[PDB]
């Protein structure tokens, strides 16, 4: 048993380290010479706790070797990025999987297994991958095995997730399913959910679509509830008491790498039919503007100009931005000339970001909480003493503590100020 | 103690039967003399398993009396229908509730309790009910008590749910909450969820909105999946393996229900969801045409005319909407088979309905459809089923079975 991994990023690198730790002879392949040199030198390319340690032993074992050129293997894994095409429908860009596939093609031998771990649009495996392979003479389920196994990981111990998480084996043939089951069985303690390529592709993208549409509903309800002087949050809690009702929570928008990427892979496949998914996307995309307009309303009624943003990340307790509605709000609030913007975020390290809470809140006429950081769960009137007007507008409903001098506004209270 | 229920249908009648069964002197009111006469004669107006039996004893006890006119009571319960204001919004027509409110107004006395059990649009209790009452001289939380307690009925386990299910008492004042609690405490073993009128109103509507939007997603996926030659049903089952993913099932549309929208109307997602669910009858009709184009004949047998399975309600039914459309189509011969629907144009015998039919279209999830063999469909011209509710669980040999996940296989 020999294995190749094409694309050695947040997915590829840990996948290589996992198979090599488990005795498989692994070749790691990347377009980046920087990444290759850095790995050949003995250093990991991505920031992950204790991964550098597990890599060290693995590279010394001779079980992991990194090249820019693939070689004949028993199994090939494509873990390259899938960007959202600049276009109207934000189509899946399968362009990177296609060139990775091309690089694998000359080293293919009968009996081999190809795995696409990258997020792909429905019918990619069948209408794009399958043809290119079958054309060489190979026959899916006989000479070669095609599997889509969408790999997703939280930087909260990626290796742990690689072992224990439930996996979807989406093979082109029932044979491809067995071939892919054979491959992940080396370390997967989790369940091997058997299905065909198209279902595994559609299903994975459905998981993020159900989420996005259901957040779009909660966000839309917040807009309706605020105009009707109804507490959206109290309403969601009531209605959710029904076993068949699972209304999601509102927020400052929908960022995430997957959460905003994935629903667009479905739209682009049949744009005229995906009206609900599109609408869902528009509503979630409008939340930064809804928050900015509300922020503008608050500062007009009060004297002060300064507003302190609390949270710049897409998720709580992460130092990751890049895919954040919280950053989008800050950027917009800054651009507004009649608004003075002050940053505050304990997780990410940046130049324009203030790290002493008191100086950030100093003379501020609003605290716009945008991320659900655990540090925000407990906050007293003392933290906000330096403010011009002690008033918080929480969009993530993270503040659980009690206030006396501070005016607290949720997505369920904001109509009480306006 | 005297209680008055205005409207004796699927809600009002069981509510009357429950309070009377618990020793309250109940006065059932309905606008329909037929319903009044049948109840006075000793027969229930709605089809429900252990209900005619519990009514019999209750009527004999003298605890339940039915009139067309209300009278002074200690508590008034409005359980009239709330139709949809004809929109792609599906707002709440409160006119029947407002009608019922008028009919009770002259019998109001200080200390009384008014309960609106009907589904109402947000801020109804505050902007519509509250003013009309306060105008007479009454003061909410002092003279009289206004409560919105939206029901949730499950035909079959109706009376059982009436006792064990958790209830939302939505009072205009904290006093109104206590007043409504005194009433339901006579039989409610379940929890009394204390809240204000607007939250109780908005939540029932939200419960309905989550459902509609989530069905609109499953229906939209079916349209996408069929064009991509993917099985929607297999996809839903896979994705639902995730604990925080609960994709709903597709269907032949969504039957009439009030939504979390203010009638004054933006509400883009709820509107879109409504349009998609409203297009399902046409999608099914178009698919039916296609099936009939590839086969010979014109006959198609519609199996189910109701919005829900094991019910007789044809009101605002997508199954009825399909039948109506299929009839209107000149190149199509239509036949309706529903065991629960007592109507003139509806065929009683399954064999005569399927006789020379080129297609059998299942539109309702009736328990009788769960188990079906090739023998039932022997009289057909072409033995082929297009199930929209995925109710058929049984196995076939000569019959061609199609689902929302299979239709693309009929080579179209
Ligand atoms: N970020 C995640 O943990 C995550 C979560 C969900 C889904 N995914 C899916 O996996 C994909 C990859 O994510 P990632 O975080 O590993 O990306 P990444 O940027 O961290 O790594 C991609 C790597 O592939 C290399 N590469 C690109 N094209 C190549 C080619 N043609 N041949 C060889 N190497 C090539 C790049 O140099 C880079 O090192 C995502 O785009 C998405 O489809 C990832
Ligand atoms: N069908 C259900 O079990 C159900 C489920 C959810 C919500 N609801 C809510 O309850 C409402 C009623 O449902 P239902 O199934 O009982 O309807 P229904 O048609 O079975 O009964 C309504 C009864 O009220 C009577 N009526 C109408 N207007 C009246 C008036 N102004 N004065 C006196 N009587 C009047 C009618 O004659 C009829 O007998 C629904 O529209 C909805 O708001 C019902």
Active site residue A258: yes
What is the spatial distance between Cα B123 and Cα A62, in angstroms, rounded to a whole number?
A: 71
Number of inter-chain CB pairs under 8 A, A vs B: 151
Residues A225 and A217: their CA atoms lie apart, in Å, by: 12
Identify the CA nearest to A280 among candidates A227, A214, A326: A214
DSSP B135: T
Q: Which two structure tokens, joined as six digits, stand for A242?
A: 């029904």
In whole angstroms, give the CA distance from residue A337 to residue A314: 25
Long-range contacts of A53-62 (CB under 8 A, 24+ apart): A54/A17, A54/A21, A54/A159, A55/A13, A55/A17, A57/A21, A58/A17, A58/A20, A58/A21, A61/A20
Length of chain B: 412
Q: Is the dihedral of CA B53, B55, B56, B60 positive or negative?
A: positive
Measured CA angle at B290 (ends B285, B291), to 5 deg: 95
Asked if A168 lies within 8 A of B225 by C-beta distance, the reply is no
According to DSSP, the residues that pair with B148 across neighbouring strands are B116, B170
How crowded is residue B337: how many other Cβ atoms within 10 Å of its Cβ? 25
Strand order of the β-sheet with A407-409 is: A340-342, A306-310, A367-369, A391-394, A407-409
Structure token digits, residue A107: 């080293």
Report the structure determination method.
Answer: X-ray
Is residue A329 a contact partner of residue A373, using CB atoms and an 8 Å limit? no
- For the range B272-276, what are the long-range contacts, defined as Cβ-Cβ under 8 Å and sequence gap of 24 or more? B272/A275, B272/A276, B272/A279, B272/B216, B273/A276, B273/B209, B273/B212, B273/B213, B273/B215, B273/B216, B273/B217, B274/B87, B274/B88, B274/B89, B274/B90, B274/B212, B274/B216, B275/A275, B275/B88, B276/A275, B276/A276, B276/B216, B276/B219, B276/B220
The CA distance from A225 to B261, in Å, is 9
Q: Tell me whether residue B412 is annotated as binding.
A: no
A114 neighbors A95 (Cβ within 8 angstroms): no
For residue A65, give Cα distances in angstroms to A28, A30, A107, A186, B369.
Answer: 6, 12, 17, 19, 61
Q: Strand pairing of B84-85 and B91-92?
A: antiparallel
Alpha-carbon distance of B254 to B270, in angstroms, equals 13
Of A19, A139, A32, A128, the closest CA to residue A75 belongs to A19
SS3 state of residue B134 = helix
Return d(Cα B373, Cα B397) in angstroms, integer. Answer: 9
Q: Which residues of B touch A283 (CB under 8 A)?
A: 268-269
- B234: DSSP letter: H
> Strand pairing partners for B347?
B337
φ and ψ at residue A66, rounded to 5 degrees: -110, 130
d(CA B372, CA A119): 41
Determine if residue A10 is labeled as part of a ligand binding site: yes
Resolution in A: 2.8
B43/B59 Cα distance (integer angstroms) = 10
Q: Take residue B34 and report the two structure tokens written for it.
A: 């037929």
CA distances to B199, B254, B275 from B212, in Å: 20, 7, 11
- 10 Å CB burial of residue B114 (0-12, 13-18, 19+) is buried
3-state secondary structure of B362: strand
**Cα B241 off chain centre by:** 29
For residue B195, what are the β-bridge partners? B170
Q: How far is CA B69 from CA A358, B30, B38, B97, B229, in A?
A: 68, 8, 16, 15, 59
DSSP letter at B365 equals -
DSSP annotation of B144 = B
Q: Which of A258, A233, A268 is nearest to A87 (CA)?
A: A268
Q: Quick one: which of A231, A125, A134, A225 has its CA closest to B229? A: A125
SS3 letters across chain A: CEEEEECCCCCHHHHHHHHHHCCCEEEEECCCHHHHHHHHCCCCCCCCCCHHHHHHHHHHCCCEEEECCCCCCCEEEECCCCCECCCCCCCECCHHHHHHHHHHHHHCCCCCEEEECCCCCCCHHHHHHHHHHHCCCCCECCCEEEEECCCCCCCCCHHHHHHHCCEEEEECCHHHHHHHHHHHCCCCCCCEEEEEHHHHHHHHHHHHHHHHHHHHHHHHHHHHHHHCCCCHHHHHHHHCCCCCCCCCCCCCCCCCHHHHHCHHHHHCCCCCCCHHHHHHHHHHHHHHHHHHHHHHHHHHHCCCCEEEEECCCCCCCCCCCCCCHHHHHHHHHHHCCCCEEECCCCCCCCCCCCCCHHHHHCCCCCEEECCCCHHHCCCCCCCCCCCCCCEEEECCCCCCCCCCCCEEECCCCHHHCC
Cα separation, A307 vs A326, in Å, equals 14
Domains defined along chain B, listed by start: 1-196 (3.40.50.720), 230-412 (3.40.50.720)
Nearest CA to ligand 2 atom 3: B153
Q: Tokens 């716009």 label which residue?
A: A368
Q: Six-digit token pair at B152?
A: 């949730």
Pairing of strands A145-148, A167-171: antiparallel
Ligand 1 centroid from CA A11, angstroms: 6
Query: How many residues are recorded in chain A?
Result: 418
DSSP label of B369: G
Residue B81 CA to ligand 2 center (angstroms) comes to: 3
**Closest-CA distance of chain A to residue B289, Å:** 20
For residue B99, which ligand has an atom nearest its CA? 2
Mark yes or no for CB contact A199/B238 under 8 Å: yes
Q: Name the DSSP letter for residue B125.
A: I
Contact B227 A273 (CB under 8 A): yes
How buried is B201 (Cβ within 10 angstroms: 0-12 exposed, 13-18 middle, 19+ buried)?
buried
- Of B21, B63, B92, B204, the catalytic one is B204
Task: Answer yes or no: A204 catalytic.
Answer: yes
Beta carbons within 8 Å of B43's beta carbon, 6+ residues apart? B52
Determine the distance separating the centroid of ligand 2 and the alpha carbon of B80, expressed in angstroms: 4
Collect all residues with Cβ–Cβ distance below 8 Å to B134 and sequence separation of at least 6.
B140
Residue with tokens 């709000």: A329
B364-382 as b/e: b if 16+ CB within 10 A: bbbebbeebeeebbebbbb
* Distance, CA of B118 to CA of B208 (rounded, Å): 14
3-state class of B148 per DSSP? Answer: strand
From A67, A171, A77, A68, select the one nearest A116 (Cα to Cα): A77
Q: Are A235 and B227 in contact (CB under 8 A)?
A: no
Cα angle B360, B365, B367 (rounded to 5 degrees) comes to 100
- Distance of alpha carbon A406 from alpha carbon A391, whole angstroms: 5
Q: Which of B170, B46, B157, B83 is nearest to B16 (CA)?
A: B46
Residue B278 C-alpha, separation from nearest chain A C-alpha, in angstroms: 13
d(CA B317, CA B308): 8
Per the CB < 8 A criterion, the answer to whether B170 and B199 are in contact is yes
Catalytic residue among A204, A315, A390, A396: A204
Phi, psi (degrees; rounded to nearest 5) at B351: -70, -40
- Paired residues of A195 in beta bridges: A170
């Amino acid at each position: 048993s020999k294995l190749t991994v094409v694309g050695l990023g947040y997915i590829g690198l840990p996948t290589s380290i996992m198979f090599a730790k488990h005795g498989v002879d692994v070749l790691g392949v990347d377009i980046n010479q920087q990444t290759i040199d850095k790995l050949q030198n003995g250093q990991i390319s991505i920031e992950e706790p204790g991964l550098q340690e597990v890599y060290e032993e693995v590279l010394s074992s001779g079980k992991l070797k990194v090249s820019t050129t693939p070689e004949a293997s028993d199994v090939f894994i494509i873990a390259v990025p899938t960007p959202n095409n600049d276009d109207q429908y934000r189509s899946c860009d399968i362009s990177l999987v296609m060139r990775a596939l091309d690089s694998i093609l000359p080293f293919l031998k009968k009996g081999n297994t190809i795995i696409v771990e990258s997020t792909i649009a429905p019918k990619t495996m069948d209408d794009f991958v399958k043809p290119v392979i079958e054309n060489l003479g190979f026959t899916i389920g006989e000479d070669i095995y095609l599997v889509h196994c969408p790999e997703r990981v939280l930087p909260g111990k990626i290796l742990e997730e690689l072992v224990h998480n439930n996996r979807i084996i989406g093979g082109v043939t029932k044979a491809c399913i067995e071939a892919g089951k054979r491959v992940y069985r080396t370390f997967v303690q989790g369940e091997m959910i058997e299905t065909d390529a198209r279902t595994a592709e559609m299903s994975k993208l459905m998981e993020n679509t159900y989420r996005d549409v259901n957040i779009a509903l909660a966000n839309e309800l917040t807009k309706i509830c605020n105009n009707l002087n109804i507490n959206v949050l109290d309403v969601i809690e009531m209605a959710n008491k029904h076993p068949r009702v699972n209304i999601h929570q509102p927020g400052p928008g929908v960022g995430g790498h997957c959460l905003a990427v994935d629903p667009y892979f479905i739209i682009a496949k049949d744009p005229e039919n995906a009206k609900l998914i599109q609408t869902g996307r528009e509503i979630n995309n409008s939340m930064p503007a809804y928050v900015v307009d509300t922020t503008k309303q608050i500062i007009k009624a009060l004297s002060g100009n300064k507003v302190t943003v609390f949270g710049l990340t897409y998720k709580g307790d992460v130092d990751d931005i890049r895919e954040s509605p919280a950053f989008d709000i800050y950027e917009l609030l800054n651009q507004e000339p009649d608004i003075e913007v002050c940053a505050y975020d304990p997780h990410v390290e940046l130049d324009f970001v203030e790290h002493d809470m008191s100086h950030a809140v100093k003379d501020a006429s609003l605290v716009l909480i945008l991320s659900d950081h655990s540090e925000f769960k407990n906050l007293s009137d003392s933290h906000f003493d330096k403010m011009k007007h002690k008033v918080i507008f929480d969009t993530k409903n993270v503040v659980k503590s009690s206030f006396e001098d501070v005016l607290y506004y949720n997505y369920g209270n904001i109509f009480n100020f306006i």
